[PDB]
Amino acid sequence: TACRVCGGGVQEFLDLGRQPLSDRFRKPDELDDEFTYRLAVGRCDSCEMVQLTEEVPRDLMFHEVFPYHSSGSSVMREHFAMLARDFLATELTGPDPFIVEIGCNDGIMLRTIQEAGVRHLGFEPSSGVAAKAREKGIRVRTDFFEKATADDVRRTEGPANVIYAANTLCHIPYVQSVLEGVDALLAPDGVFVFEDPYLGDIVAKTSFDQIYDEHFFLFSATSVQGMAQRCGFELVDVQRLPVHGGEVRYTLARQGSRTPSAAVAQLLAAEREQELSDMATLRAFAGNVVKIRDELTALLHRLRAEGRSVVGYGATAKSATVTNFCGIGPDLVHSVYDTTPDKQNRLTPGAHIPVRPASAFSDPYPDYALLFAWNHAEEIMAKEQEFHQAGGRWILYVPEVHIR
Ligand SMILES: Cc1cn([C@H]2C[C@H](O)[C@@H](COP(=O)(O)OP(=O)(O)O[C@@H]3C[C@](C)(N)C(=O)[C@@H](C)O3)O2)c(=O)[nH]c1=O
Numbered sequence: 001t002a003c004r005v006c007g008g009g010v011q012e013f014l015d016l017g018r019q020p021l022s023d024r025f026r027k028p029d030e031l032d033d034e035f036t037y038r039l040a041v042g043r044c045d046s047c048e049m050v051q052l053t054e055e056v057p058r059d060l061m062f063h064e065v066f067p068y069h070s071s072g073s074s075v076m077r078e079h080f081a082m083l084a085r086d087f088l089a090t091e092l093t094g095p096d097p098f099i100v101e102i103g104c105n106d107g108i109m110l111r112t113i114q115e116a117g118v119r120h121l122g123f124e125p126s127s128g129v130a131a132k133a134r135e136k137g138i139r140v141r142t143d144f145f146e147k148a149t150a151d152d153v154r155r156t157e158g159p160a161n162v163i164y165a166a167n168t169l170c171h172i173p174y175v176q177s178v179l180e181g182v183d184a185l186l187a188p189d190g191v192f193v194f195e196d197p198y199l200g201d202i203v204a205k206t207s208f209d210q211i212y213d214e215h216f217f218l219f220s221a222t223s224v225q226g227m228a229q230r231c232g233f234e235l236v237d238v239q240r241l242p243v244h245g246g247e248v249r250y251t252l253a254r255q256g257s258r259t260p261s262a263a264v265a266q267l268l269a270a271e272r273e274q275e276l277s278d279m280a281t282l283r284a285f286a287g288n289v290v291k292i293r294d295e296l297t298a299l300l301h302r303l304r305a306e307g308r309s310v311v312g313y314g315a316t317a318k319s320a321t322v323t324n325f326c327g328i329g330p331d332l333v334h335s336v337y338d339t340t341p342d343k344q345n346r347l348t349p350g351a352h353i354p355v356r357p358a359s360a361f362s363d364p365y366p367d368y369a370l371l372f373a374w375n376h377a378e379e380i381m382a383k384e385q386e387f388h389q390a391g392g393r394w395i396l397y398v399p400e401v402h403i404r
Pocket residue numbers: 068072073074167171214215313314315316317318319337338339340343358373375376379380383
């Protein structure tokens with residue numbers, strides 16, 4: 001397998017087996033045929049980039065029925081509004097500033113830009129969520145960001161002061177074409193800013209459910225610094241974020257155009273000191289993955305033997321990896337509750353557990369809820385105090401299998 005960043009050799013450390021598309025939710029009547037692929041992860045020999053060993057073609061994941069609605073979380077709505085206000089106070093202060101977002105989804109970040117009257121453009125090749133952004137008055141192009149479409153936007157709209165991508169850069173194997181696009185489009189003094197699940201968090205929390213079709217790369221500061229450098233950019237800031245199980249926001253500028261924050265060198269030194277991307281650490285993570293599988297299925301089977309009911313909460317893309325690697329289906333977890341209309345009255349991929357509206361998670365409550373949306377624990381548990389007061393308990397499997 002050749003590294004998608006630098007062409008070095010990729011060495012596998014974890015094999016999650018055959019997996020379905022994480023975001024495809026079938027009607028119960030649909031034939032049980034699904035596209036599958038081998039999900040496994042390795043680390044490049046030369047640049048330390050951790051990445052999957054099989055690419056799922058983009059069109060199979062992102063398209064008119066891609067289901068994820070960013071705005072379905074109040075935490076994430078606030079998180080992106082604040083980001084947007086931060087950009088409007090700093091990088092977008094010129095005359096006629098321009099910001100491009102890669103992956104704007106339903107307009108969770110760009111609405112704030114639009115409301116500020118700032119010129120902007122979102123790339124959103126999944127047309128269903130693209131439409132929701134256009135309804136809020138956001139300018140959206142229903143296309144993938146890549147070298148050529150970036151060219152097209154530079155030609156017609158001029159340079160962007162800011163190009164931003166959240167939970168999207170790590171989804172793109174063709175990151176070199178994206179970087180070529182960023183080079184063509186970004187102002188000489190602008191910044192390309194992206195935030196994605198952080199390898200450090202994944203390793204410390206054993207959060208293997210962060211590994212699935214749409215997550216091609218598990219970025220670290222070490223590997224991003226390398227990938228930037230090789231394309232003529234430089235990692236000039238890093239910021240850790242608690243969202244989505246733990247992320248880093250990376251800020252790239254043209255090389256030497258700005259001085260790197262002390263936070264960059266410090267995070268690098270921490271990564272180096274903790275041997276984050278050494279093959280041995282990544283293998284130890286893989287070993288911990290198997291322990292979590294074993295403990296979780298032992299728990300679920302015990303619950304069933306003791307006549308306790310178990311449902312799941314959150315029909316996450318992440319959960320596809322849990323249910324398929326661990327072999328958890330409707331016999332162990334009878335339903336999954338979720339707020340996304342187009343995931344309701346469907347079956348989860350691979351495991352085929354029925355998905356029901358969260359409004360259906362109500363008295364009489366099940367004994368246990370397996371919390372797939374564990375990155376949303378605070379927000380969800382706050383809305384579900386009655387469940388816990390009634391005696392229902394949460395099953396978590398990050399960072400360890402435990403009930404509370
Ligand atoms: C907050 C809340 C959520 N829910 C439901 C809504 C969603 O279906 C799901 C959470 O999905 P959530 O962890 O945010 O992303 P997922 O892992 O799917 O990941 C998806 C896919 C993708 C692009 N690859 C990615 O990285 C992220 C950004 O999004 O859980 C409730 O029911 N009640 C609630 O109160």
